[PDB]
Amino acid sequence: MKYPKQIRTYCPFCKKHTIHKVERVKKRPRSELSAGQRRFRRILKGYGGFPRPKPEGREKPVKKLDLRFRCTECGKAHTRGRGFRVKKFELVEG
Amino acid sequence: GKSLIQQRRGKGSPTFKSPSHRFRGAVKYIPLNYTQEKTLRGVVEEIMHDPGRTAPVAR
RNA sequence: AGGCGUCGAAGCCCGGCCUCCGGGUCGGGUGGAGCCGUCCAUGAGACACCGCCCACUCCCCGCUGUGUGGCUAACCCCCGAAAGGGGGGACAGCGGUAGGUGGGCAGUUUGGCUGGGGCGGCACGCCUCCGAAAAGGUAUCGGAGGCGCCCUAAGGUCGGCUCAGGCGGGUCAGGAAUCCGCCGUAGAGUGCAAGGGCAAAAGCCGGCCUGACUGGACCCGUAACAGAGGCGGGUCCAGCCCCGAAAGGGUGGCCUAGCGAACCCCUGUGCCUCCCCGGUGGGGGCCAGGGAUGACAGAAAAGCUACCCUGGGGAUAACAGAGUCGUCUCGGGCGAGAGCCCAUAUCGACCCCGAGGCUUGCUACCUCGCUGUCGGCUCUUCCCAUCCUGGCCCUGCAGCAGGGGCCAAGGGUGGGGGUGUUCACCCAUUAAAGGGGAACGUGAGCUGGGUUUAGACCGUCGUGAGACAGGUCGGAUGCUA
RNA sequence: CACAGGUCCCAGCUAGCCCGAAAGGGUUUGUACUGGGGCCGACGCCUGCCCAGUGCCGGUAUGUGAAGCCCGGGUACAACCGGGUGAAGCACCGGUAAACGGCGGGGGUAACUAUAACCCUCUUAAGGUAGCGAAAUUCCUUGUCGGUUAAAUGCCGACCU
RNA sequence: CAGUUCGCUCCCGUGACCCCGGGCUAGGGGUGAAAGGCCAAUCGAGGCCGGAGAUAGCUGGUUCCCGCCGAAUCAUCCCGCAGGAUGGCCUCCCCGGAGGUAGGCGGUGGGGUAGAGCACUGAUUGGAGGUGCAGGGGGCGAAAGCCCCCGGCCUCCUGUCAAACUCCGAACCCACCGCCGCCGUAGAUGGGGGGAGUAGGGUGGCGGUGUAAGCCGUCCACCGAGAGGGGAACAACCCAG
RNA sequence: GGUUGCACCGUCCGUCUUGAAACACGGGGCAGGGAGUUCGCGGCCGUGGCGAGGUUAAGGGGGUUAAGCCCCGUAGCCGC
RNA sequence: GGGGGACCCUGAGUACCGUCGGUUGGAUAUCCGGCGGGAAGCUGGGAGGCAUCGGCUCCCAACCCUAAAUACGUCCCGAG
Ligand SMILES: [Zn+2]
């Protein structure tokens, strides 16, 4: 599907309809300073079997779109509803 | 599983131990202090068959 | 835009030098006073001068490691009670840590439904039609199909128009290119299955837009009655907006499919919080969006057992019984015909109606705290749908014989070859050498050749353990009624 | 099953293989005519092709590759992030089948009848050579022919589908 | 006689031979001329004591009497299918205080089954008429095309169909209202709390499926959980609780 | 009351199971023994005390042959 | 027995840091052990639940001993 690069929509911070740029969330790796990762590293040490499930090749054919819309007037970003599943996502100047 | 013959041999049981009491004895040279810088003369007394050597021994 | 020049310059000669040998740098000396643009070219101008670099390389000092060669003094190996001698050597050995390899050794897993189980299939998550019995609900490995997407337009609104097919007439132009007229209830189209809905539209053609948005309430469905995490849908309040003159509509696709808990992690945003207090780095918490578990209400996960073991199950298969008779055996109705004429001496197509439980199958009703298998031997008994013996009828019955049928179950129906065989085939006789039931009669009567444990070989399949309704050799038969 | 015989593999000694937590130890009072590890199995004649796969061995220019170390950022110090160095092992290359295993498949002919391989087309690492064959291997099968019997799902000989 | 013995028959019997006393190898271990054989009547991991009264959704058992009421084997979820949880059905106690509806009559609405029918969608025998209609078969013509037969497509007549067809359409069922009847102040409808059992049903009528038996649902009548009187005995059939 | 006769009726007991006289399992006789116990937490009920308050725990004193009996004990817990 | 000092003393492979294994409710914040490092030391040092800086509060390790209140019953008295 083709999606506009800019859309005029409501801005929660400006409390009015402004121009928002469309951007996609980039999935960063796990942080080693988080409590969950600290617990995982602590329990992985020493003798014993693997303590967590190990899923292999588990993923949906197509995934939902995690989009953020950033207001061009205030510079803050927000979300618009739930994601939708399309295999092809093309941002166009339309 | 069970052990192999090679594995059982390493434990030194009488099934695998060499019977080193029916043999004529170890064949080693005289200590090197006698041989160094000096020449010794000996006489052959007897030639015998060592049970396990694959070679005759002499006194 | 001047800088160099006794703070010594062009033009002449050889020497070393790097070098795309382009052509530049430089010691000495004949040399004793000149050298470049600025001007134009160059995509970007000065070998005018003053600065920092960037591309390769070398060398002077210091730092760092990696490898190589040598040494003995740690350490080790040998000889010797010892003294000491010899060999190796900062390796090896030992201690700590890091990655790989690793069925040598372990703990485990290898799902479920299933007209037994296995293989197969998924009825294991959803949508439509029939089943389904005119409110609701209703199952089967019931029947017929679809889904795990796609669309910035195929989404919102406003204006205008009417489709498929057919007929008649037209330059190339024909069955089919484009155009005029008429009939035309949708026979078209609506993204995709099916059902339903849509004609001054929900279809086609255009204009303007992003309501496919933010903070919340209530209700229906999955899941009737009648409990529900998650999810889907409907009716609204407020904010900011879109289309329109206005009414009015807009919380995605005309309605019904296109999808997912806990924990953890990533992103957005603006608040709370971290042990006596304060600042900083970092962490934790609240709200929103996303990464998936298809066995789809969400374990991470391969097999053999014939050396097998345990708890059970007639909730469930093999032998046998029971129900049924598709199949099997045996009949019947009609008569196209074949028989020199003649349907019925004999055979009887295509169809149709039955009997038996003697073949096989189907169900899973009795029996898994045991009802001992096939075949053979011994012995007893029963049925008739009669093979011979007794008596008859028709004949395409001259006789001798044959073909078909009727009454009749007293008697008989035997001996041998290969094969474990029943059966079937064959041999010599015979009046004939009938088919079946009795827990496929009969192992507290026998035998043990086959089948169906534990040993072993061959062929095929499997990486392997191993397996084969494939062959092959051996392999136990209890008893005082 | 074992066996004498054949052949292959590892090892020059502080070796190779093996027991163990370690210390120490078995082979070993041993030294390649030896010690240890597979497979076949007297004797006679022989033992053909294939290294693409799975194993094992040698190399490893090059890529990846953990900790440690070094450099930059960050932290008034660390946690944390990016880069360089980077052994073994994999990737890659070569030997190896008396290592595990494998050794195929369609058309037409030479019609001096008919039917055979000389022959031409896909195809792999290669297409089963000498032998033996209805075999303890053959489903059809009680294959077909010959001998054995009066009679042969047996037995022997032969053919090869 | 014996928890592996006896008789006949058979095999080795100078060798890898048979037997005795002293020793060593101990359980994931020993030993094995390899059968998973042997290791004190025990071996695909010995025996003794301990963990230990281990665990099981699987089998068995569970002790006096009378009185009152009295089920279920049906839906959703679970590596769930011989087991559990939430509901449905039973029982006991309490609050609250005037309505409630299993049956019937009339009314206001809803439905598409049986039957029937061809008006859509798809099948279906023959005939007649129209249409050259892009079809085929012949004759026929240099070529522009004709003449018939057959075929296709429409209309009519004639003879037949539909679980996944409907221009029609019952019996019947459901929702609501008024009334009759019945229940209720000796307390119903409803609400709160305590305790369960039930997750194999069977026969019978109806529906899908199957040659049939049977399998799967549905109806709630009978057995299950039910005496007595009958069908000769009978779970289910009749009278009757 | 013991035994027996006649007429009619009556296929044992426990158990899983839709279905038991069962050719489904447990059943020679008799006597004794034999199976919902204890603690901790929680829900609920019957009754009793006090009541915007309720109650003590460990422990202490008095008395007693004695561990019985009498008084104290506000820490703590629940509620407001 | 009290005041002052400007001199001296007050525990080292230890405290602590990194990493690894075990253990713990101890969670970036328990304790023990191995390996590689490793101080100050009176003008000194440590703790205050992630790490560091400032304040404030408390304390002085790396040496030793210590009755009573406690745990048990091979034994005894007494009791149910
Ligand atoms: Zn804004």
CA distances to B10, B15, B45, B57, B59 from B52, rounded to whole Å, are 21, 17, 21, 11, 17
- Are residues A12 and A25 in contact, defined by beta-carbon separation less than 8 angstroms? no
Residue A1 CA, ligand 1 centroid: distance in Å: 26
Q: Tell me the CB-side half-sphere exposure of residue A11, using CA atoms within 13 A.
A: 20
- The span from the CA of A13 to the CA of A78, in Å, is 9
Residue A21 CA, ligand 1 centroid: distance in Å: 11
- The span from the CA of A81 to the CA of A68, in Å, is 10
Number of helices followed by number of strands (H, E) in chain B = 2, 2
Is A15 labelled as part of a ligand binding site?
Answer: no
Residue B51, SS3 per DSSP: coil
- The span from the CA of A20 to the CA of A11, in Å, is 8
Q: Tell me the CB-side half-sphere exposure of residue A17, using CA atoms within 13 A.
A: 4
**In degrees, to the nearest 5, what angle opens at C-alpha B55 toward C-alphas B54 and B56?**
135
Residue whose token pair is 């009488």:
B14
The neighbouring-strand residues paired with A77 are A70
Element containing residue A77 per DSSP (H, E): strand A77-78
Residue A11, classified by CB atoms within 10 Å of its CB into exposed (0-12), middle (13-18) or buried (19+), is buried
Residue A19, classified by CB atoms within 10 Å of its CB into exposed (0-12), middle (13-18) or buried (19+), is middle
* Of the candidates A28, A31, A10, the residue with the CA atom closest to the CA atom of residue A76: A10
Residue A33, classified by CB atoms within 10 Å of its CB into exposed (0-12), middle (13-18) or buried (19+), is exposed
Q: What is the resolution of this structure in A?
A: 2.6
Is A14 labelled as part of a ligand binding site?
Answer: yes
- Are residues A80 and A36 in contact, defined by beta-carbon separation less than 8 angstroms? no
Which experiment gave this structure?
Answer: cryo-EM
